[PDB]
Amino acid sequence: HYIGDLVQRTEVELLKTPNLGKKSLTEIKDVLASRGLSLGMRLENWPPAS
Amino acid sequence: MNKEILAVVEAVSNEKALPREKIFEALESALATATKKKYEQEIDVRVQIDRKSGDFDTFRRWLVVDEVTQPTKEITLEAARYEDESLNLGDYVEDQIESVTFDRITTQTAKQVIVQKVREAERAMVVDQFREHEGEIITGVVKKVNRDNISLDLGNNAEAVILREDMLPRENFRPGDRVRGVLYSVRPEARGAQLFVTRSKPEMLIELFRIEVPEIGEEVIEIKAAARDPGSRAKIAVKTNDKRIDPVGACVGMRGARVQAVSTELGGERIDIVLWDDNPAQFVINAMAPADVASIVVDEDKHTMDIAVEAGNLAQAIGRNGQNVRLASQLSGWELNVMTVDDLQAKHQAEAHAAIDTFTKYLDIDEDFATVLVEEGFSTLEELAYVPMKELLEIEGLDEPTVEALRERAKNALATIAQAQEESLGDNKPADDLLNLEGVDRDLAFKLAARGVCTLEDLAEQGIDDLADIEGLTDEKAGALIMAARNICWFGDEA
Amino acid sequence: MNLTELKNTPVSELITLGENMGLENLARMRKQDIIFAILKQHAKSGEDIFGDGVLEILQDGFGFLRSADSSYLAGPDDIYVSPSQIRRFNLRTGDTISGKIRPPKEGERYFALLKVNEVNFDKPENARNKILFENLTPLHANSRLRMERGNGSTEDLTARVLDLASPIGRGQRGLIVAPPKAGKTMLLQNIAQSIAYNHPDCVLMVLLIDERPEEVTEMQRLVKGEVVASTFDEPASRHVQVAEMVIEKAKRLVEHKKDVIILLDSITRLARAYNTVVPASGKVLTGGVDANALHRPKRFFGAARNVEEGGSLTIIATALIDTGSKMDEVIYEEFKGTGNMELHLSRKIAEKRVFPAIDYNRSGTRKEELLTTQEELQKMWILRKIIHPMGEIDAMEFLINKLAMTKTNDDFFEMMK
Amino acid sequence: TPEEKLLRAIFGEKASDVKDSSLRVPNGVSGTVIDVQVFTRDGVEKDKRA
Ligand SMILES: Nc1ncnc2c1ncn2[C@@H]1O[C@H](COP(=O)(O)OP(=O)(O)O)[C@@H](O)[C@H]1O
Ligand code: BEF
Ligand SMILES: [Mg+2]
C-alpha cells in the first residue's frame, strides 16, 4: 500500500506482479518516476518522524 | 493522413539524394522529436511508419539499461520474462497507443527536418564521392582565408577546406586564386566542411611525380616512400626496376628541371630525391644526403641507427630543425644518434675497445693472465650471462678454479639482484615514527605505508574513507587511530 | 489445450465444451472464436497453454502461427511470436513451432509465444544446425513408389494403369493435362489413398485450389495427413497466402530430411489468382498475362526436387485445358516443358464412361531407368511396344480388359507373356 | 528560392509566421469577457465564431 515498502522493491518485481502489462505499467512508471523519486532505494529515519 | 505522407514522399525533388528509406528514417526522427514535445517525458519514439505498407505505429523502446529515470525507456538486463521479451538487449515493445498526430508545430518541425536532411543527403552524396575519388591533384579557386583553414570551390557547388597544417607556413592566400592540392581524408557524417584537400602531406609529392615524371605511372620507377616537413623539405626514396634508368638524372630532369618544377608548384619547398635500397642501413646512409658517413651501428631490436657524420659537416648534416635527420627518421621510421665530435667519433671502434674502467676485476684470480676479449664483444653484459661451451674453449686459462670463481661470482650476482629486487619492491620504508604509533604493528605499518604515505604529518590529514579497505582494522578503530594521530600531530601543539 | 486436439473436434462439441467450462454460451461466435475464448478462459484459470502453429513472416518482423484446420489462414487462433526468436534461430516460414503460450492482455490481439519447445518435430538446435533449401543439390527421382492398392478393386484400375504407364518416385514433378469432365477429383482421391495405405512410411500433404465446399469436406476427412484447401470464399490474396504457407512448410520439412508429397489441382486457377494479385507492368502478353505474373507460378511448380542427402519433395499437379480461353493454353505451354513428369487424361474416352482415360501416347517419364529396374524395364518396354499399334480407344479397351481380369503387375506380365 | 516556394505550397500555408502580433490585456487590468464582436470585410471568408 505505502511506498515506504516499495522503496525496498526494484523493477524486477514490477512485471512479476500479476496483471501488469502495457498501459498499467506505463502509468506505474510515469506518475511514479517522473516526480523525482526512484523505484528502489533505502533510507534510515522513517520510524521516528525525524 | 498516410495518403498525405505518400503524396509528400512521391513529391520530393531529391529522390536520388533522399530515397524512400531515408525519407521514412527522417519521419522516424521527426516523430521522435515531436513526441519529445507531446509529453513532458523526454522519450525516444521510433515509429517505423511502414511507408510502403501503411501508416505510423508508435513504439516504446525499452532502452535496456539499469537506471530508472524516464522509466518508459528503462529495463535491466533480465526483466524480460513478461510478454516474451526473453532478451538481455534489443527486445522492444509498443505501449503507446493513439499518440498525438501531426499538429501544426510538428508539421513545421518535420518541414525543417526534411529540408536539413535534403542538405545532409547532398552532403552524404558528395562525401561518398569524397571517399571514393581519393586520387589525383585537383584544382580549385578559394573563397575565404582564415587563420586556421581556407575554403575552396571547383564549380557545381563543390565546397572543400584546406586546414592550417595542410597549407604552407609562408604561402600567401587571398580569395580568388586557383590553387591545386590532393584530396586526402574521408568524413562521411561530418557537420562542417565536406571535402579535405592538402598541399603538405608526404604522398602528395608522390602523386606530383606520378603526373610529372613520364616514367612513373607505367611502373618503371616504383616510388618507394617519402617524408615531408610542410612547405619546408620533401625527401623521397624511389626504386627502379630497369637497369639503364638513372633516377638521379631522370626524376630531376635536365640540371634540376622536374624537381625544380614540382618545387615551384609546391610553393617553394626543397626536395631531396634519393635511391631506395633493400638494406635499411644503406637506406639510412643514402637518405641523409648531402652527407657522408663512416660510422654505421644498426640495432634491430631497439630500432636505432647510430649514423654519425664526420666532424666538420655537422651544421650541414643535421641542418635546421634536424630536417635532414628528421625526414630520414621519418623515411625509415627509426631513431638516429650523434653526439661525438672528436673523442673517438668512430662509435664502433671506440665502444669495442673502451672498457678499461668496467673490466678491472673480471679474471681476478691473477690479473697476469690475459686482457679482455672483444671477439665475443663483452658489450651487453646480460645476453653474455649464459653462453654455450661451443665458444668457451678457445681462450686459455679456464682451469677448474676459474669456473669455481665464475660460480661464486654468479652467486654474488644472484644475491645482489635479490637485494635490489627487495629494495625496489619495498617502496614503503616503515620508519620508527610509523611503528611506534600504538595499535600499528609491522604488517599494519606495511599496509599504512602502502596506502601512499610514509610519514607522520600527512597521516593526520586523511579521513575514514582514505583508510577504507583497511586490512586488520575497521571504521571505528580507524576513527580512533586517526583521532590519536590528529592529537599527536595537531591537537598536541608539539614539534 | 492444444490447437488441433480442439480443432479436429466438431463445432457442437466445442460449444458444449465451452459451456461445460462455465462460459458465455459460445454457439454465437465462430468455431475459431470459440476456441480462442476457451483458451482465454483456461489461461484465466491460472495456468499456461501449450500451442502449435506453422510460421509466417511479413515485412514487419514478428511471426504468426497459423493452425491446421484454419487451412493456414488469418484468425484469432493464430499465435503471436516476438521477432526475438527469429533473430535468435532464424526461423523461416514453415515451422510447426510448438511451445508455451500466455493469454493476451489489453492492447494485444493474439497469444504470445514464451519459449520454443519443438521445431518441426525436432530439437531447437536443428533451428541453428541445418541446411537451407537453395543450397543443396537437386537430383532425379531415385526411389520407386508403388501405386497399385492390392485388392483388385474397380478403382485400383487407375493406380495400376499408371503403374504400367508411368510410375511415381520421390522428388518427381508430375503435371496432369486434362480437359474438364475427365475424372480429376476421384483420381486425386484414388492415388492419395493408395500412396497412404500402401506406403504409410511416406508423408502426404494435399492441396486443394478453387473447389466446392462439399469437395473440401470430402477431401479433408478421407485422405491421411494435412488436407489444406483454399476455396472461393477467400480472395486471390488469401489464395497466394495459403499457397506460400504450404510451399515454405514443405521446403522446411524437406530441409528436415522428410518426404513430402504435394497434390495440387489445378495450376491454371492459382495462375489466375496470381495474375489477380500482381499489378500490371504496362504491357499485356498473349492470353492476358503479365511479365512477372509467371515467375510466381514457375517457382511454385519448380520447387519440386529430389534430395539425395535426406528427405524429398514430390508434387503431383493437374492442369486445365480446353477452356476456350487463351491464358490457360499459354500457361499449359509454359508448364509442360518445366515439369519432369508429364501425363495426359483424355476427354473423349472419359465422356464414354470408360475410365480411366489415360493418353498412353503422350504419357512419359523423365529418366525412367532410375525409377525402373532391369527386367522391370524389359516388361514395361515390350508392353509399350505391343500397345504401340496405333490405338487410343481400343487401346484403352485392351488396357482396361487385361487390367480387370488381373490383380497385380506381375500377374498381368506373366499372363500376357 | 522556388524550392522554398513549392515547399511552403505543398505543406499548405506556411511562412515566417513567428510574429506574435497578437492582442493581450493591458498589464494591470483584469476582467471577464462577456461579449465578442467580429466584423469582416466584404469578400473575406467568415470564421465559425462570426
Ligand atoms: N473410375 C471411374 N469409375 C466410374 N465412374 C467414373 C470414373 N471416373 C469418372 N467417373 C464418372 O465421371 C464423373 C466425373 O464427375 P466429376 O468427379 O465432377 O469430374 P472431375 O473429377 O473431372 O471433376 C462422375 O459422375 C463419375 O460417374
Ligand atoms: F470438377 Be471438374 F473437373 F471441374
Ligand atoms: Mg473434380
PDB file of C-alpha atoms in Angstrom, chain C residues 245-386:
ATOM      1  CA  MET C 245       2.302 -21.133 -46.489  1.00  0.00           C
ATOM      2  CA  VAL C 246       2.247 -24.695 -47.788  1.00  0.00           C
ATOM      3  CA  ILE C 247       5.254 -24.266 -50.079  1.00  0.00           C
ATOM      4  CA  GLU C 248       7.505 -22.903 -47.343  1.00  0.00           C
ATOM      5  CA  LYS C 249       6.220 -25.576 -44.958  1.00  0.00           C
ATOM      6  CA  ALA C 250       7.149 -28.275 -47.478  1.00  0.00           C
ATOM      7  CA  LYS C 251      10.535 -26.623 -48.062  1.00  0.00           C
ATOM      8  CA  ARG C 252      11.337 -26.572 -44.342  1.00  0.00           C
ATOM      9  CA  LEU C 253      10.100 -30.139 -43.828  1.00  0.00           C
ATOM     10  CA  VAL C 254      12.324 -31.282 -46.700  1.00  0.00           C
ATOM     11  CA  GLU C 255      15.210 -29.386 -45.102  1.00  0.00           C
ATOM     12  CA  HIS C 256      14.370 -31.505 -42.035  1.00  0.00           C
ATOM     13  CA  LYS C 257      15.022 -34.588 -44.241  1.00  0.00           C
ATOM     14  CA  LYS C 258      11.406 -35.625 -44.752  1.00  0.00           C
ATOM     15  CA  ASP C 259       9.486 -36.968 -47.744  1.00  0.00           C
ATOM     16  CA  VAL C 260       6.724 -34.521 -48.694  1.00  0.00           C
ATOM     17  CA  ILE C 261       4.168 -35.224 -51.439  1.00  0.00           C
ATOM     18  CA  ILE C 262       2.102 -32.228 -52.603  1.00  0.00           C
ATOM     19  CA  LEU C 263      -1.063 -32.842 -54.598  1.00  0.00           C
ATOM     20  CA  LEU C 264      -2.209 -29.730 -56.409  1.00  0.00           C
ATOM     21  CA  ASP C 265      -5.214 -29.014 -58.611  1.00  0.00           C
ATOM     22  CA  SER C 266      -5.284 -27.061 -60.627  1.00  0.00           C
ATOM     23  CA  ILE C 267      -2.384 -24.837 -61.732  1.00  0.00           C
ATOM     24  CA  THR C 268      -4.386 -22.548 -64.031  1.00  0.00           C
ATOM     25  CA  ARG C 269      -6.571 -21.437 -61.112  1.00  0.00           C
ATOM     26  CA  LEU C 270      -3.609 -20.394 -58.971  1.00  0.00           C
ATOM     27  CA  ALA C 271      -2.061 -18.742 -62.034  1.00  0.00           C
ATOM     28  CA  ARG C 272      -5.227 -16.673 -62.489  1.00  0.00           C
ATOM     29  CA  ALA C 273      -5.172 -15.843 -58.774  1.00  0.00           C
ATOM     30  CA  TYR C 274      -1.555 -14.684 -59.042  1.00  0.00           C
ATOM     31  CA  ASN C 275      -2.315 -12.596 -62.141  1.00  0.00           C
ATOM     32  CA  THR C 276      -5.060 -11.100 -59.979  1.00  0.00           C
ATOM     33  CA  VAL C 277      -2.688 -10.253 -57.119  1.00  0.00           C
ATOM     34  CA  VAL C 278       0.326  -8.932 -59.106  1.00  0.00           C
ATOM     35  CA  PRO C 279      -0.032  -5.417 -60.580  1.00  0.00           C
ATOM     36  CA  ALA C 280       0.478  -4.718 -64.261  1.00  0.00           C
ATOM     37  CA  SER C 281       3.792  -3.630 -65.780  1.00  0.00           C
ATOM     38  CA  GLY C 282       2.399  -1.594 -68.677  1.00  0.00           C
ATOM     39  CA  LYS C 283       2.277  -4.496 -71.158  1.00  0.00           C
ATOM     40  CA  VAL C 284      -0.026  -7.482 -71.693  1.00  0.00           C
ATOM     41  CA  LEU C 285       1.083 -10.657 -73.483  1.00  0.00           C
ATOM     42  CA  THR C 286      -0.957 -13.480 -75.021  1.00  0.00           C
ATOM     43  CA  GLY C 287      -3.972 -14.630 -73.027  1.00  0.00           C
ATOM     44  CA  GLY C 288      -3.841 -11.570 -70.803  1.00  0.00           C
ATOM     45  CA  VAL C 289      -0.876 -12.333 -68.532  1.00  0.00           C
ATOM     46  CA  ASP C 290       1.974 -10.168 -67.273  1.00  0.00           C
ATOM     47  CA  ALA C 291       5.757 -10.472 -67.430  1.00  0.00           C
ATOM     48  CA  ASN C 292       6.428 -11.346 -63.779  1.00  0.00           C
ATOM     49  CA  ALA C 293       2.975 -12.898 -63.241  1.00  0.00           C
ATOM     50  CA  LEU C 294       4.563 -16.150 -64.458  1.00  0.00           C
ATOM     51  CA  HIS C 295       7.538 -16.042 -62.066  1.00  0.00           C
ATOM     52  CA  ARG C 296       5.462 -16.995 -59.006  1.00  0.00           C
ATOM     53  CA  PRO C 297       3.767 -19.967 -60.743  1.00  0.00           C
ATOM     54  CA  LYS C 298       7.061 -21.074 -62.311  1.00  0.00           C
ATOM     55  CA  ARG C 299       8.812 -21.111 -58.933  1.00  0.00           C
ATOM     56  CA  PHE C 300       5.754 -22.823 -57.434  1.00  0.00           C
ATOM     57  CA  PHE C 301       5.863 -25.687 -59.866  1.00  0.00           C
ATOM     58  CA  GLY C 302       9.630 -25.973 -59.846  1.00  0.00           C
ATOM     59  CA  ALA C 303      10.199 -26.124 -56.101  1.00  0.00           C
ATOM     60  CA  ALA C 304       9.982 -29.901 -56.578  1.00  0.00           C
ATOM     61  CA  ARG C 305      13.321 -31.718 -56.462  1.00  0.00           C
ATOM     62  CA  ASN C 306      14.823 -34.949 -55.155  1.00  0.00           C
ATOM     63  CA  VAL C 307      17.147 -34.527 -52.177  1.00  0.00           C
ATOM     64  CA  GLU C 308      19.692 -37.342 -52.226  1.00  0.00           C
ATOM     65  CA  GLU C 309      21.092 -36.461 -48.781  1.00  0.00           C
ATOM     66  CA  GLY C 310      17.817 -36.887 -46.871  1.00  0.00           C
ATOM     67  CA  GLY C 311      14.124 -36.259 -47.435  1.00  0.00           C
ATOM     68  CA  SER C 312      12.470 -35.497 -50.772  1.00  0.00           C
ATOM     69  CA  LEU C 313       9.834 -33.224 -52.304  1.00  0.00           C
ATOM     70  CA  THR C 314       7.448 -34.650 -54.912  1.00  0.00           C
ATOM     71  CA  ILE C 315       4.497 -32.822 -56.488  1.00  0.00           C
ATOM     72  CA  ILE C 316       1.515 -34.140 -58.465  1.00  0.00           C
ATOM     73  CA  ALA C 317      -0.260 -31.214 -60.120  1.00  0.00           C
ATOM     74  CA  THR C 318      -3.197 -31.127 -62.519  1.00  0.00           C
ATOM     75  CA  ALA C 319      -3.763 -28.508 -65.220  1.00  0.00           C
ATOM     76  CA  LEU C 320      -6.820 -27.166 -67.036  1.00  0.00           C
ATOM     77  CA  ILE C 321      -7.170 -27.160 -70.828  1.00  0.00           C
ATOM     78  CA  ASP C 322      -9.999 -26.918 -73.378  1.00  0.00           C
ATOM     79  CA  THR C 323     -11.449 -23.929 -71.516  1.00  0.00           C
ATOM     80  CA  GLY C 324     -11.990 -21.869 -74.677  1.00  0.00           C
ATOM     81  CA  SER C 325      -9.702 -19.105 -73.429  1.00  0.00           C
ATOM     82  CA  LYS C 326      -6.076 -18.344 -74.305  1.00  0.00           C
ATOM     83  CA  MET C 327      -4.390 -17.717 -70.944  1.00  0.00           C
ATOM     84  CA  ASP C 328      -4.899 -21.338 -69.893  1.00  0.00           C
ATOM     85  CA  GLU C 329      -3.313 -22.518 -73.145  1.00  0.00           C
ATOM     86  CA  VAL C 330      -0.222 -20.337 -72.738  1.00  0.00           C
ATOM     87  CA  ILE C 331       0.027 -21.406 -69.078  1.00  0.00           C
ATOM     88  CA  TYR C 332      -0.051 -25.045 -70.195  1.00  0.00           C
ATOM     89  CA  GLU C 333       2.654 -24.232 -72.747  1.00  0.00           C
ATOM     90  CA  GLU C 334       4.864 -22.698 -70.063  1.00  0.00           C
ATOM     91  CA  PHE C 335       4.311 -25.543 -67.587  1.00  0.00           C
ATOM     92  CA  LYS C 336       4.528 -28.503 -69.986  1.00  0.00           C
ATOM     93  CA  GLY C 337       8.274 -28.056 -70.508  1.00  0.00           C
ATOM     94  CA  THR C 338       9.202 -27.194 -66.927  1.00  0.00           C
ATOM     95  CA  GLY C 339       7.937 -30.414 -65.351  1.00  0.00           C
ATOM     96  CA  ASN C 340       9.997 -33.588 -65.118  1.00  0.00           C
ATOM     97  CA  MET C 341       6.867 -35.767 -65.387  1.00  0.00           C
ATOM     98  CA  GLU C 342       4.001 -35.358 -67.858  1.00  0.00           C
ATOM     99  CA  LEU C 343       0.712 -37.252 -68.064  1.00  0.00           C
ATOM    100  CA  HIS C 344      -2.473 -36.645 -70.028  1.00  0.00           C
ATOM    101  CA  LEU C 345      -6.121 -37.510 -69.400  1.00  0.00           C
ATOM    102  CA  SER C 346      -8.351 -37.779 -72.465  1.00  0.00           C
ATOM    103  CA  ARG C 347     -11.885 -36.399 -72.584  1.00  0.00           C
ATOM    104  CA  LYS C 348     -13.295 -38.419 -75.493  1.00  0.00           C
ATOM    105  CA  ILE C 349     -12.793 -41.692 -73.620  1.00  0.00           C
ATOM    106  CA  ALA C 350     -13.953 -40.016 -70.398  1.00  0.00           C
ATOM    107  CA  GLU C 351     -17.316 -38.963 -71.842  1.00  0.00           C
ATOM    108  CA  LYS C 352     -17.790 -42.580 -72.987  1.00  0.00           C
ATOM    109  CA  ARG C 353     -17.724 -43.675 -69.306  1.00  0.00           C
ATOM    110  CA  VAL C 354     -14.533 -45.653 -69.988  1.00  0.00           C
ATOM    111  CA  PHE C 355     -12.282 -44.721 -67.073  1.00  0.00           C
ATOM    112  CA  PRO C 356      -9.504 -44.018 -66.553  1.00  0.00           C
ATOM    113  CA  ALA C 357      -8.825 -42.169 -69.834  1.00  0.00           C
ATOM    114  CA  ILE C 358      -5.040 -42.183 -69.978  1.00  0.00           C
ATOM    115  CA  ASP C 359      -3.184 -40.911 -73.043  1.00  0.00           C
ATOM    116  CA  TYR C 360      -0.759 -43.818 -73.426  1.00  0.00           C
ATOM    117  CA  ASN C 361       0.792 -41.918 -76.352  1.00  0.00           C
ATOM    118  CA  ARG C 362       1.686 -38.614 -74.663  1.00  0.00           C
ATOM    119  CA  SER C 363       2.498 -40.212 -71.298  1.00  0.00           C
ATOM    120  CA  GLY C 364       6.166 -40.087 -70.377  1.00  0.00           C
ATOM    121  CA  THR C 365       8.731 -40.167 -67.603  1.00  0.00           C
ATOM    122  CA  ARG C 366      11.984 -38.216 -67.409  1.00  0.00           C
ATOM    123  CA  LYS C 367      14.899 -40.632 -66.928  1.00  0.00           C
ATOM    124  CA  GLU C 368      12.790 -43.675 -66.086  1.00  0.00           C
ATOM    125  CA  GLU C 369      15.765 -46.034 -65.658  1.00  0.00           C
ATOM    126  CA  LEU C 370      16.374 -44.548 -62.203  1.00  0.00           C
ATOM    127  CA  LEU C 371      12.732 -45.478 -61.484  1.00  0.00           C
ATOM    128  CA  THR C 372      12.646 -48.955 -63.063  1.00  0.00           C
ATOM    129  CA  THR C 373      14.997 -51.951 -62.904  1.00  0.00           C
ATOM    130  CA  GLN C 374      16.333 -54.446 -65.453  1.00  0.00           C
ATOM    131  CA  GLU C 375      13.564 -56.927 -66.308  1.00  0.00           C
ATOM    132  CA  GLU C 376      11.089 -54.407 -64.917  1.00  0.00           C
ATOM    133  CA  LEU C 377      12.014 -52.091 -67.796  1.00  0.00           C
ATOM    134  CA  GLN C 378      12.055 -55.086 -70.128  1.00  0.00           C
ATOM    135  CA  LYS C 379       8.417 -55.884 -69.330  1.00  0.00           C
ATOM    136  CA  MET C 380       7.311 -52.247 -69.449  1.00  0.00           C
ATOM    137  CA  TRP C 381       9.046 -51.659 -72.798  1.00  0.00           C
ATOM    138  CA  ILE C 382       7.675 -54.756 -74.522  1.00  0.00           C
ATOM    139  CA  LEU C 383       4.166 -53.900 -73.339  1.00  0.00           C
ATOM    140  CA  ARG C 384       4.588 -50.327 -74.610  1.00  0.00           C
ATOM    141  CA  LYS C 385       5.759 -51.804 -77.924  1.00  0.00           C
ATOM    142  CA  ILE C 386       2.801 -54.183 -78.274  1.00  0.00           C
TER     143      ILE C 386
END
